[PDB]
Symmetry: C3
Subunit: 597 residues, 3 copies
Amino acid sequence: QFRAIIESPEGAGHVGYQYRRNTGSTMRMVSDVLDERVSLWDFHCDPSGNVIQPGPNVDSRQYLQAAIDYVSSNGGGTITIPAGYTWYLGSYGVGGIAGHSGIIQLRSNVNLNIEGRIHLSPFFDLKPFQVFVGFDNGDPASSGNLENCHIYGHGVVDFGGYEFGASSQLRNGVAFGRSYNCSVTGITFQNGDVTWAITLGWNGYGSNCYVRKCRFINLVNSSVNAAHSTVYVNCPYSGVESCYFSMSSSFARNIACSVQLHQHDTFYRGSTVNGYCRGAYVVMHAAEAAGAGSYAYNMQVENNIAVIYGQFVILGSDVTATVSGHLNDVIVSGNIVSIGERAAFSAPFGAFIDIGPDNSGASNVQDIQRVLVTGNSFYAPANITDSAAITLRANLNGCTFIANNFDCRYMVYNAPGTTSPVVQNLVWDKSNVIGGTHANQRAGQNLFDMQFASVVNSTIEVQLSCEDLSMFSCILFPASCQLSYSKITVDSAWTKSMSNTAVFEGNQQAGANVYVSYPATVNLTSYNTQGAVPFFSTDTNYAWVTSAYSLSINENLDFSPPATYTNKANGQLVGVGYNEIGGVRSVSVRLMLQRQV
Amino acid sequence: QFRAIIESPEGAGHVGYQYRRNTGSTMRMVSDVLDERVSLWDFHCDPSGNVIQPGPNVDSRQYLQAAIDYVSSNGGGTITIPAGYTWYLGSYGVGGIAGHSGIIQLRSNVNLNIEGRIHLSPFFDLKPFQVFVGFDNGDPASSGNLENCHIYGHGVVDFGGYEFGASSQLRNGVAFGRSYNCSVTGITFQNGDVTWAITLGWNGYGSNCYVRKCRFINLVNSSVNAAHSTVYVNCPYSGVESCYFSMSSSFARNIACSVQLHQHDTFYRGSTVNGYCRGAYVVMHAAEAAGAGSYAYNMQVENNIAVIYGQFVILGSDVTATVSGHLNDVIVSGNIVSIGERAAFSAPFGAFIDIGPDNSGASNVQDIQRVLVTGNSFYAPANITDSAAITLRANLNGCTFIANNFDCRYMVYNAPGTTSPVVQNLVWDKSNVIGGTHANQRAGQNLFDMQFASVVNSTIEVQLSCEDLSMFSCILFPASCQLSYSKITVDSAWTKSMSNTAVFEGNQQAGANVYVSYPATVNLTSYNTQGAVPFFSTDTNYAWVTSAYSLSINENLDFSPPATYTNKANGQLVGVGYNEIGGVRSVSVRLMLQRQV
Amino acid sequence: QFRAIIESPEGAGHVGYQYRRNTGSTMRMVSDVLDERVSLWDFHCDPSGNVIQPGPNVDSRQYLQAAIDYVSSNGGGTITIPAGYTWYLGSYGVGGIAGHSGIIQLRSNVNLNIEGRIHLSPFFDLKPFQVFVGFDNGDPASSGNLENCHIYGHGVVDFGGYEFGASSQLRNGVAFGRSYNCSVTGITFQNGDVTWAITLGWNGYGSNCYVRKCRFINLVNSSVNAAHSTVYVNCPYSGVESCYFSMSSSFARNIACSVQLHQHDTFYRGSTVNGYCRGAYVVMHAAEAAGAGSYAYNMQVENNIAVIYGQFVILGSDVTATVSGHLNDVIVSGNIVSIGERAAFSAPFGAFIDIGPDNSGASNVQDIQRVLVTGNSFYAPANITDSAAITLRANLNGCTFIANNFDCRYMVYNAPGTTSPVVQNLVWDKSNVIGGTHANQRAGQNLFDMQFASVVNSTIEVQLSCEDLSMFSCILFPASCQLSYSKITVDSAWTKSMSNTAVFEGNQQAGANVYVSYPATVNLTSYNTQGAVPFFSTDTNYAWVTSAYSLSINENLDFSPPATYTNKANGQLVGVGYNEIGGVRSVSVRLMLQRQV
Ligand SMILES: CC(=O)N[C@@H]1[C@@H](O[C@H]2O[C@H](CO)[C@H](O[C@H]3O[C@H](CO[C@@H]4O[C@@H](C)[C@H](O)[C@@H](O)[C@H]4O)[C@@H](O)[C@H](O)[C@H]3O)[C@H](O[C@@H]3O[C@H](CO)[C@@H](O)[C@H](O)[C@H]3NC(C)=O)[C@H]2O)[C@H](O)[C@@H](CO[C@H]2O[C@H](CO)[C@@H](O)[C@H](O)[C@H]2O)O[C@@H]1O
Ligand SMILES: CC(=O)N[C@@H]1[C@@H](O[C@H]2O[C@H](CO)[C@H](O[C@H]3O[C@H](CO[C@@H]4O[C@@H](C)[C@H](O)[C@@H](O)[C@H]4O)[C@@H](O)[C@H](O)[C@H]3O)[C@H](O[C@@H]3O[C@H](CO)[C@@H](O)[C@H](O)[C@H]3NC(C)=O)[C@H]2O)[C@H](O)[C@@H](CO[C@H]2O[C@H](CO)[C@@H](O)[C@H](O)[C@H]2O)O[C@@H]1O
Ligand SMILES: CC(=O)N[C@@H]1[C@@H](O[C@H]2O[C@H](CO)[C@H](O[C@H]3O[C@H](CO[C@@H]4O[C@@H](C)[C@H](O)[C@@H](O)[C@H]4O)[C@@H](O)[C@H](O)[C@H]3O)[C@H](O[C@@H]3O[C@H](CO)[C@@H](O)[C@H](O)[C@H]3NC(C)=O)[C@H]2O)[C@H](O)[C@@H](CO[C@H]2O[C@H](CO)[C@@H](O)[C@H](O)[C@H]2O)O[C@@H]1O
Ligand code: NA
Ligand code: NA
Ligand code: NA
Ligand code: NA
Ligand code: NA
Ligand code: NA
Ligand code: NA
Ligand code: NA
Ligand code: NA
């Protein structure tokens, strides 16, 4: 009788236990203490209750789903995926997750402690899939929420190396769904061709979702893969920290981004990226504005390390028929970024910041402002013509650069005869240090190439830290660019031998509220009078100049040109020098030309 | 016989076990392996040893205390609070913690792994309480220490929604006490009206205490609550990182602060705050100086995201009869902060930095210096008159601003006819970017309103980035403010149409070691002489000016005014221009006035 | 029969269990569920299988090694070191780790969850040791890898207080070896005299190794200890975050460093250091370049708090017969550092950044560039003569300072008649704020002491924020230092009473591509002519000056000196002033001297 009970599945419920033989402890049964934990092994059995060993020819999916469903029924808990085993998944899930090509359905309060390895079987080759899905409905708009679901451990999700079957397919590791207080910590995602590794939230619905101390390795492998973003953050008060992202595929240099920050109060910090095209998008899509409003604000990209091939941070916002997206209150700081070794134009245009047109190419829908870029480093190798501190390709309502170090081909750039952005409140502080890696490479090129429709309320304070006489100019405005209510200065250091410093092809520096200064060489002639004597410019190009001063020594004994000049209505400069002995003087002098500064 | 033993509480101590049938493993009994872990279930029993189910009508407090006391007796360990259950607490603790309105007494080396939910029963409604207390005595001065106590897990402490009964009451979640190597990680504290969620240390006694990845949600709910600070850090080598703080109550906008950093080598990093009045205090209270000395130094507030209604960082120090507190070596960097949408003056004055008078209102007791504020963003909506980069309300011995972006009503402010602080070593670097949100709102107002007793060894380098002709002046010193050994500059950009740029109501810019420059409009008249000819100012207000130069074009052909001016003893400016044709000239010119720069 | 089986070591394999009595769960045996975890207790037994109690007189080493070896055999897992016990280690390991004075050999996929205490027995007194070793061979070049090995928990590794027996000995806590995806989290290392606490990687071989939330306390205690670096990072894509490091020994002030970052893509963040000589080395040793190439790049030191006695960050690179090491793409940001209270010259020279010669003292082997130092604070007490923002002691190919706050004796320093470094691309932006703690201490001293062989492509923009008339000069170049293609400026603020501002002992400011400006006092005499009249310098020292302007008021009525000057071939300055009444004038005026700026 008793032997039978003991050898039965209830035997453990008949063996008494009391913790450490403490007389004041609960008199329990072994089964009670065992019931305090739960593993996959508890559900990984055949219809007769016999345990089944996982392996390449066993599909563990129904067993893991049964575990999650059961623990869900009790109010939650943590299911362990045991170490020292690989658990293969080999069929699709059913019900609500079928619309998402779901394998496993996550449930609220049911955490997974993944210590072993989860692998995809070749059933998934050339097919879409999303491994873990928190939606409970095919239609995300009619889905319930996922709350308090955490995935963590020292384990591994391995996507089996399979290529995409078709570019239109989607593949994901974890889709938390309409996700509140959910996280992934510690896990290695590897060996795939996927669209995302993790997505958080759904069109603004969700909160407090995080990815921390995870690794993402080799998650693009084919030319079929349309696009890849390793973590898409689509709910507020969420972010990514202390993660490692690496790709080795060539295709990843053209298509892969590490992070999308698409809702307010989101962050990307303390991570290391290598082998990717892009670092992060910081974006408000109107099409995603349902759950948390139409503004992306409080967006933070900080203290990351990257080697990328395209753009580090891309800013944007866009509209739909009924919603307009807005982006503001952004900080990009402390990141050290480089474009990896590559040929010029062999990948998307290299940039630290990109102001990106929308997915249909429009550049007149964006509302981006109050962005602070500060205390970052950027480097691109000397050969990479297509490298810029900022590629400013769509309308910009403000962006502030302070105390960065940029060492690349262009500081500000936009391609001519593409978009003509409207620019407001572009602020480039004199504390931005311009590196010299690209010195001597800039023939035909303008360091600050202002290829815009208009610039207003902007500040460009150019300071070189070494010579580059190859460059056509430090800063150039084409005649088509309006310029008003702006400050544009070129410091003289390392400019003495430059023919052109600042160029205003439409003579826009004449505007009533344009404040500029830059070096120029000017020819002057004096009157013949002995004593105090006026010197006048030969050219009549200076009706806009409020004052000028000498940047050249005077090699003469018998006279000196004026130290300082003002102008005359006919556009000459004029100053008062000194003839110790009389005679008409003729000199060529390097001047600092100033207007309202 | 054997059946009896097996069904007894010692039955598990009679069932042999050897790990994985390994012949070299220990021959143990099931009870030994079970004894490797411990849960609340092991103590949650009646006097007969029968397990009791937790619930709203069961008080789990004595059972949890018995578990902690027992594990403490064995040298420590980790007690799990099981998932899928809510454990209610419904009575006060006894002994040493009674003086602290304690519920549970923490003990050294006994960690709590909280995976379920701990809730307060309505016994606590309208009463004080501190849920977990690490002091062992009613009098903190006679308390022993708490060491090596960690609280962690995916669980929840829920304060039951109860309001305070009286403003003088105190309520806390975790009071570690005189706490060494203690931490809270992962836990959600929610649904209360409390004074603090967590306190670390006691008046400088403690070390290596941290709060990490915790959430604090809705912990103020009534007008009775006197004050709320979510984490009070009162021991050195301690801090808060990667936490989330949110309030929805109106009252929280007026009374709630996220963090107090009150001892040296403490930090607040990588967190997100919404709905609070204040971000952090960085303070040395003399009354708290017993355990770690009288200096708060090495204080770090970094990489946080906040939407607040009052002040982001408040600095201070104060004194007692016998102790003087000092604050120095502070860094505030990388934070992106905004004042949330509100009416002007509807909450405490909005500020990025506040120099706060002591709790009795004194402004002449503080010793604050060597503070660095760098690479932060601040924004306040255009309507919020009461918004400042720094509200400088008490004596300041130094604070350095570099490469911040401030977009609010005032840069520097103090209210006139309140405190008259004594200011030393206020440094505002030209790399601080002043935003334009408040342009056109500043009628009657000074952007830098220097409402102080005295300013010395200070630097204010004003740089606008857009026009605001509504403002009375960029910077103004009342006659009551002494000014010496200081540098005060206003860059000309966007100032051409300003009637007043810098204003010294006591003509303080004349001081021997004052170094200033700013734009002014000046009327000048020349002598009638043809040729080189002097121009003189009509007004005699310029005896302090060392040089001036033209910021205006010359619309004339027949003459030019001087490019550069110096002065004369009677206070006129004078320069040498050029009359091509003779005649008395009269012109109004915008000049850069300079003094010793 | 059945009684015998049940009391046997297989008894638990005969007691059936099914999780929570769920009919769809696996019918298992108690032994199966127990086998899901493993502890030291499972191996801590005598030859008869009887458990042995750990203690000061028991050597736990063979038992722990047996556990690791066994778990390794099953594909890995996590062995717990139980809480509430101290486990002593009292003999050396055997085999592959014997060459490393190894105690325990780590194995791939076998994690240690250390919750108790591991202590060293006095067998190790005066001997070398490395507690945990991941190499499997005496010769690291012939060692296999360690992968997926994590050490974590709330436990403690205690080195027993024993002193080193001889300086040439080595002692370590954890040597992961050729280590891929390995980490230490949560652990306290204490009470030793050791060389390192943790090393990661081996000469570039390894990846994704981290130390997080660990504490290192009192790990130097004797004068025998040659050198100490708490964490040596010798593999890429690895780092240290949120750690606490403290020393109390005097010897630690002279010999101890917290971190070595010696391979690319490595970081040191969010940590607190006290009592150490140095913060971090960022170094490419040619001798260590085998596994990850010859370049250290993407090196990040950020958001740390330190009180040190020598240098905070030391940069270097060096060569071997066949390999040349290079260092580039470094960021040092957000750190708040101070030199602790000490006598001048009582420890290694105090510095925020050191450019360190190699271990044989060579200063002409280094290739260091593209370094960004930004948004840091540094303080040293007024008495510490040996304190510098940068001690630039070996060849430097570039380093950029922006928006730091440095408050110490020197800004730039190198000792004369030591090394004569070759300097390129030293950039000190005007946004670096120079503190006043050392005002009045600088007799005989130059704030920027340019004791170099040559300086090129460099920028020094000096800005004072208070007076220090004790200093000999703001910046001084000895005649032996060449200077070309550089910008050197001293802002006038707080300089009016300085006899020397910038000093060029070799008249190097005359160079064709040197761009300089600084204040000087000049004596001038005019001609006697009434009206517009020239003033000329008495001295002929100004042939290099392109323009000068007045920094002094004019106390005269009857005349004014020129506002602005240029020069003449004989080296005089000349300008045009105004005599209202005739007469030879003689004045002494403070001028801003400018050259090509
Ligand atoms: C790979 C990636 O992330 N790319 C970024 C762009 O994302 C956009 O394209 C993606 C391509 O894969 C996604 O669209 C695709 O997936 C959609 C969502 O799938 C459906 O809904 C899921 C919830 C279900 O599980 C699925 O079964 C499926 O039903 C699908 O509707 C599209 O048809 C398909 O092409 C991506 O869509 C978002 O995905 C997230 C995460 O899964 C999800 O939370 C969202 O709900 C979903 N959004 C929308 C609108 O559906 C889609 O956004 C991204 O647009 C771009 C940003 O840069 C551009 O835009 C900037 C702003 O104008 C501009 O500054 C910049 O210059 C532009 O380049 O960045 C990546 O390219
Ligand atoms: C809510 C909050 O934190 N407010 C900050 C101010 O704190 C000060 O007021 C608090 C109001 O709750 C606390 O005082 C209250 O509690 C005291 C401590 O309780 C006793 O001791 C405990 C150890 C026991 O468990 C309790 O049972 C009880 O016996 C009590 O003595 C007071 O009477 C009561 O009002 C707070 O007190 C500190 O609390 C911490 C954490 O519990 C504890 O470690 C300390 O020991 C205790 N300190 C003292 C001195 O007792 C008390 O400090 C805080 O002052 C303010 C800082 O800003 C102001 O001061 C700046 C410096 O001059 C100035 O720059 C600024 O402008 C000022 O506004 O910030 C919050 O307001
Ligand atoms: C304490 C410390 O870390 N000091 C830093 C300097 O490190 C150099 O000296 C150390 C002194 O302990 C180490 O050398 C010692 O150990 C060597 C390694 O031990 C062998 O190999 C191990 C793998 C085995 O387990 C051991 O059993 C043993 O066989 C040994 O070869 C030496 O003979 C001995 O003195 C340190 O050596 C490195 O150690 C790490 C971690 O263990 C290991 O991964 C490496 O493989 C090993 N490297 C080498 C080359 O062997 C050795 O590097 C460090 O040099 C210094 C940097 O600053 C100087 O150099 C800069 C660049 O030129 C210059 O800018 C600066 O001014 C200089 O001061 O910083 C610390 O001093
Ligand atoms: Na779908
Ligand atoms: Na901005
Ligand atoms: Na246009
Ligand atoms: Na009390
Ligand atoms: Na400071
Ligand atoms: Na006064
Ligand atoms: Na060795
Ligand atoms: Na640099
Ligand atoms: Na030389």
